[PDB]
Symmetry: C3
Subunit: 535 residues, 3 copies
């Protein structure tokens, strides 16, 4: 607990001693540090010389930093990360510049870009999310991250804002170490290395404890939680499971216990088509957030600092309400001259996740070319301009007027058409199409006109127009089925106009005209019957 | 003001004396308490024995608690509620465990479930909202709560999050007492019991006052407020009323006065179809929130504590700016040894409501069976899976392409069909349908195909298909009206194919074929006219 | 720095001396003041007399106030604005009433009304936004405010909530002076008046500096930013430009420098149809907010207070990391007796704008009469009831099922029809129509019925109905094209019913009936051919 050294941009510093260090690690967050450091001898008149301004070039913002506290027989490292705030404060004719050093996980909270992960497990997602930034990814045995997605969209949020929105949907911690961040399931954290905290103590081998504190919340505790999502086939709400009572911690320090104030439970019924596997992992994901705020604590220990964010400490010798074993969260350090070196290690975590993943707003999208590899649904492929890649596509269910049992109005839009997409429960994985639009490129066949004469349902490729025209002014219905054949019906008349050949195929036939009748055919008229007569 | 006793889980406590009590009641909130209590004699080595850990089992989280301060000639009760935070803190070789006791109104903020109140007054709503949890409901004479709703949806928010979102839409206070919560209109609170606060004092019968404070805000004050909602019939915006100047308090402590910085007023024009009665009660509901933050105050009194949250105290003898009468809000108590017992009673309240009621996102819904009991509209009944009950139904207006004056494209969806619902101004009482969908259960008649050959408008029950087929590849329009009768029109040809019998009923008739004509009917041909000739 | 005088409601005050003044100006905010003032001699018993309550009538809320500190040879004015909080606090038998004085820019944050600016530049918008309240508008040379809008909607937000949501979309500061607020581009603020801050000092003409502070953030810095919006014609995403590296400040106090932690940059792809000029000004608008939080500082100077919010101060003689020139932001003043008079002037600003402009929710709108002055698009004019003016109209793109290349289902709604509008990326400038509705005024031609017999596509004016009826129960398709002419097709039969005249115009014609054939025409039958025969 003596003589730390600060390596700034690969070069160890000796011009400015540190008068304060506060290193704060934490589960499911970036870890941070804080260096308050000052000059030992240089006055304010002799501060602005060439030697002191040289070292502040090493301390400039964005340079790496690693502070290593030398034990005397070991060399503890405490932090390794980038300078983010360098704030110099000068008063009472002396200066004291603060540093704020942030981990490499703070490199992800900088960016903001939308990206499409189409068919990947979350382990394949979090690999490509951390490899993209430049921090290595150590993994653990997770039962939730081996889960394949048909689509997975990060929609205009940060990379660390997408990260813990996914780590809260699977229920797995983040353990940011010094060299590599590692993921671990909270249940697998048990049976790890175990430092004992005794109320007796009175030994040199035991751990000295000061300022112990623990707190039992029951403000909001679900006793039973289920997350149920829609099933598109066999239209029902299939709940993934009523997952209550997660096994975590040990006796009288478990979040289990602390019985809920309502015995009925909890229920959320998502309307997005979630699978039974995903909503099952989501139910114990949300359950883990509410229960783990129930038991909290902190313990201000001595210096030596071999504690990390994975291990669990047990309380022994205490009262039967206070004893138990729980996983360490949020290791802190402090280095003053008032105190030598301490470690106020803690237990448990808060519930609310600072990230944001959902896009509530409407968008437009161009329908891409044909694809078939989906399951049997009417999902049509779209291209979203908000998504950056114009080559990758998204499935999207089509909303149409009168889509009945087998009797649907089916006019599937052509590739290259513009649509109006909205998202099921604001989820970027589940878009749905609300219509189609015309353009200056894809022109409507008619401008809107005052007392709009014609109302059409015209479908064509440009070589042949198969129309259904209703003229409300001239009181017509023109089935212009092809450009040649018009079946005209006035309000006062009727017609049937052909180009080549007309055909009647019935069993019997009747004609009845009271005023007159005239049949006329040039160049041949034949009338054939087994009994022909004229009356 | 001596010797309070704490009954924890029905058993009065004497092992741990209380070193602090802070009981905070408040209008339109849960009331709370805070007990800091410690052991009188037991050291840390003798803390973990069987006698002390027995009493902490009574102090465990979720147990009821009631603290009763014994006056000596009376027995005041101060609080009755559940333990919610039990936090033990140990430092300097002594421990001091804090309790946080919460009212039975905190039982409602725990839950989160969506529920459908179809046809009930709000008095019938708040009865079934408080009976469901387990707190009795005392009522007062309210002019706003006797208001019937066609629908009323709590959509995935808490019960206390739905409660004051309704108490802010009707403009009525909540008065949480010790034994039963009671509702009261703010205007009916006047002419209640009246404790006088004098600047002269100098008596034993008068009330001793310390640390008086009052504050006059005018940051945002509407001078005139109107809330106007849409009227579906006779399409206009019918405002419920320009309700300004609510009568509350008395002279120079009324929120009236403190003239607005803008004289023009305030206007919100909701697009949801609110009634004229509801938007009238909403206008003085929102007006009550802005004005009541205008005049605020607090008065730190002596011990005896006969003040409750309903009565109003008048100031007399003060300056003519400072005098007046206003309803007591937010009674507090404190019990130290530095002070004996005090009551820092207050006046007025803040404006923002911590609850949340609105669902902005899209959903899907299955259309239920036929119902008729609505007023004359095209509202079709739907079943929402996000709502828990599959038996109860919701009306929903139908969005269709080209719904004109009397000339509408009317294809009302069958019962059992899936729709795309969105909500008018995000209101769960007003859904609207944006389309209909196909399914693996309700299959589309055709898969989407590359260069999609056919475009259909087919309507059927499965025994008979009445179609309107346009084949864009083979350049046809096939009016397959029934499975037998096809009216074919090629791009180069035409046809009219029948099964049984064709009919012509005109006045005159013409046929004109320039290349050839042939009529053929087997087994009989008859031609009848008053003048028959062949040319 | 002696003897300020406070003019309250046009009348200078002398009954109550001021024991504290804190005047806080700030760029892109309202400026404020705070007056703690107390009585010099009047006791509490003699506080409530007629002379002291007279002066508090001048100090009442909403009265104007102007405090003028008299230098002795000059007369500095410091503030001019309205009383907003008057809070009297009385304790220890003495009172000390606080005033909170707010600028005339606080008059705009009061209101909340929706308004439609159809065709105006932002300079013509901010003129009519400040003239409406009653504060004059001084302008500067802005390259962004001379930008014409096809539409511009303030949708149910405050006037100051619409103001800086527009000043952040153009990237121009607000400089609130004492007499007139002035706008200025941040780049044009350079080469202004320049007060030098020296580390040497040691003169009477130089500026005395205490408590200097500066802070370099790099928490979130875009290295390159582009904002790309949709182009309706030639459907693509045309980015306005990759505007990085804004020129502001000078060397070692510029936001340029402090290199980003990610070198890749930043990208947002809006789906709303923004122009190339608007998204270009939006890219340097958002870039200005992130970079200007990078360099911050504050300098506690002496009294005399000739500094204003526009000028820039340079640091000279300091270290080469610390020197530089940057524009003054957030001038403060303090007037105690402990300190004589100070001015803790600052540099740089925070990033997040407290205002709110976007309406995510659905609405309804009545389609207005015909208008033509748009560019070539299918935008149809609507009237929004949420917008206050029923005379002004909004364009809105129409969403229709199957709007293909030139083959669109075109049923443009009549004027006076009700629609379902949603907004592209929640933007009130870009609505889009999702359907049309029936009414009690615009009645559907049929009530929805159980086992709904008929499905119609009927278009009419009331004098003549041109229908397309499919009866699913009676298994018919009735092309009631006009009220007289019905083309009936049963499931077992067919018909063709006319009123006046039928016509066949083909080249060849065939009839084929296997059971029987009968043609009948009363009062005349003619059969004409070049070769007539009967077989």
């Amino acid at each position: 607990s003596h003589q730390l050294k600060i390596i700034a941009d690969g070069k160890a510093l000796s011009l400015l001693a540190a008068v304060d260090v506060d290193t704060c690690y934490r589960v499911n967050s970036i870890p941070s540090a804080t260096l308050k450091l000052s000059v030992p001898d240089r006055p304010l008149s002799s501060f602005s010389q060439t030697d002191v301004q040289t070292e502040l070039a090493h301390c400039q913002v964005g340079k790496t930093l690693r502070l290593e506290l030398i034990d005397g027989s070991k060399k503890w490292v405490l932090f390794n990360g980038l300078i983010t705030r360098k704030a110099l404060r000068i008063k009472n004719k002396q200066l004291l510049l603060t540093l704020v050093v942030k981990h490499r996980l703070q490199l992800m909270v900088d960016t903001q870009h939308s990206q499409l992960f189409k068919d990947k497990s979350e382990k394949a997602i979090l690999s490509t999310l951390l490899n993209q930034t430049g921090i290595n990814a150590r993994f653990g045995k997770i039962a939730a991250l081996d889960q394949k997605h048909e689509q997975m969209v990060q929609f205009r949020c940060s990379d660390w804002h997408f990260l813990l929105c996914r780590l809260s949907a699977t229920g797995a911690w983040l353990l940011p170490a010094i060299e590599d961040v590692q993921f671990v399931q909270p249940d697998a954290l048990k049976s790890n290395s175990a430092y004992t905290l005794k109320s007796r103590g009175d030994e040199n081998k035991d751990i000295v404890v000061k300022d112990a504190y623990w707190q039992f919340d029951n403000q909001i505790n679900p006793a039973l939680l289920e997350v149920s999502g829609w099933d598109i086939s066999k239209q029902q709400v299939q709940s993934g499971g009523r997952y209550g009572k997660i096994a975590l911690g040990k006796a009288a320090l478990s979040p289990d216990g602390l019985a809920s104030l309502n015995k009925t439970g909890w229920d959320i019924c998502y309307s997005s088509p979630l699978t039974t596997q995903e909503s099952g992992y989501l139910a114990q994901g949300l359950l883990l957030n509410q229960r783990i705020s129930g038991v909290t604590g902190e313990f201000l220990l001595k210096g030596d600092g071999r504690y990390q964010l994975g291990d669990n400490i047990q309380l022994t010798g205490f009262g039967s309400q206070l004893d138990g074993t729980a996983s360490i969260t949020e290791v802190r350090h402090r280095l003053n001259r008032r105190i030598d070196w301490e470690t106020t290690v803690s237990i448990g975590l808060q519930h609310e996740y600072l990230p944001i993943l959902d896009a509530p707003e409407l968008h437009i999208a161009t329908v891409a070319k044909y694809q078939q590899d989906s399951a049997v649904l009417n999902r049509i492929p779209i291209i979203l301009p908000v998504l950056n890649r114009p080559n990758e596509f998204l499935w999207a269910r089509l909303g149409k007027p009168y889509a009945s049992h087998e009797s649907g109005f089916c006019f599937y839009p052509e590739p290259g058409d513009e649509v109006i997409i909205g998202f099921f429960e604001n989820d970027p994985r589940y878009p749905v199409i609300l219509g189609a639009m015309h353009n200056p490129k894809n022109k409507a066949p008619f401008e809107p006109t005052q007392d709009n004469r014609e109302k059409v349902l015209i479908v064509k490729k440009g070589e042949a127009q198969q129309q259904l025209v209703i003229d409300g002014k001239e009181k017509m219905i023109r089935i212009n089925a092809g450009e040649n054949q018009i079946m005209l019906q006035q309000d006062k008349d009727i017609s049937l106009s052909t180009k080549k050949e007309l055909t009647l195929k019935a069993q019997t036939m009747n004609a009845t005209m009271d005023k007159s009748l005239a049949m006329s055919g040039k160049n041949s008229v034949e009338i054939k019957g087994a009994k022909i007569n004229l009356t």
